[model samples]
Target: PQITLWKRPLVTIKIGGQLKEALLDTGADDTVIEEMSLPGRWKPKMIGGIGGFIKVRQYDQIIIEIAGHKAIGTVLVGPTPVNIIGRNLLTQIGATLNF
Candidate 1:
């Protein structure tokens, strides 16, 4: 289990070569990105969507650019409406809320 500081600022992130609106949520365990062209092969997951939980994909060790700070980790591709940068990657970029 991963524990992190509550409430963190959001920043623009580029995942899979596409820019997206992502939230840097320290409380989250996995980073989530808006559904897109998931490269290679990925596992499936149930996630939020227009009609409730939608079948989403998860790409492990996926590369994403956070405010130009490079990092790689597990990324859940789903219809979350807004992207989320979870602890999986946030810790890699030295994002400590200190609160």
Candidate 2:
């Protein structure tokens, strides 16, 4: 098997005063950030999911830069093991994931 490369701008978000990076993924429908890693300014909001409307929060401002292009957007924060770069930032850059 051959390996294919899919590269996009890494998105950085400040959580607890620390900066974290996540790979830009265009296939994702929503922006996802770690709930525990969210900054203090974020306020929880409700979202409709498969289980029904669940409490989610707008966590942080995501900053993404690629090839001199930069964008900023608000993202939802939830409990997850890894940070994901979702459609929130990808749509701004008009990126498509090849994988």
Candidate 3:
């Protein structure tokens, strides 16, 4: 979808077999989602955001369907303002920034 910069690029993504909304953030380095239950063991991790660093649970090899594309990679669960689909998964899905 050719989205306009006037609004945040929000897209529907499927994770854990459930549909959820996430932001397609080109500025983010890693995909981080709002805290939620996911099957599997996670490790303690921390990621820095706009404000500062926050504790997060790192889940690896998580499969997510982004805008109909499938990607398997690390996903961080933490207290984020919103679910964000970052460069890690974006690159796998062939998402590129266009001006």
Candidate 4:
């Protein structure tokens, strides 16, 4: 399916069997979610974007669900201002940046 590149394209997604809303950021390269405890082991790292860089936990078995579509991939858990859905997961959902 197709989605728009709005000023702030927000969508609802499920992570760790919990529903959460996230911003669809085309400029971002990876999906980032608010810090949370997941069932997988991950290595700690840092990432950059708005403001500056912050430490994050990288998990490989990430399952994101929206409406009826599901996307599985990597997810970065960090202390972010908000949840961000990036290209890595977007591509799996077949999300297109339609103007």
TM-scores of all predicted structures: 0.77, 0.54, 0.95, 0.88
Per-residue lDDT over 1-49 for candidate 4, one digit per residue giving the tens place of the 0 to 100 score: 5555546678788889898889888899998899887788888988898
Question: Rank by lDDT, descending?
Answer: 3, 4, 1, 2
Clashing residue pair totals per candidate (backbone < 3 A): 0, 0, 0, 0
- List runs of model 4 lying over 4 Å from the truth: 1-7
Query: Tens digits of per-residue lDDT for model 1 on 1-99?
Result: 223535546678887678777777767777877768868578988755346666778788787899779998888887776788888898999878653
lDDT of each: 0.76, 0.60, 0.92, 0.84
lDDT of model 2 at residue 48? 48
TM-score of 2: 0.54
Residue 87 accuracy (lDDT) in model 3: 96
Q: Write the per-residue lDDT of candidate 3 for residues 22-55, one digit (tens) a residue.
A: 9999999999999788887799998997688999
Q: CA lDDT of 16 in candidate 2?
A: 48
lDDT of 2: 0.60
Candidate 1: which pairs clash?
Answer: none
Better of 2 and 3 by TM-score: 3
Extract clashing residue pairs from model 3.
none
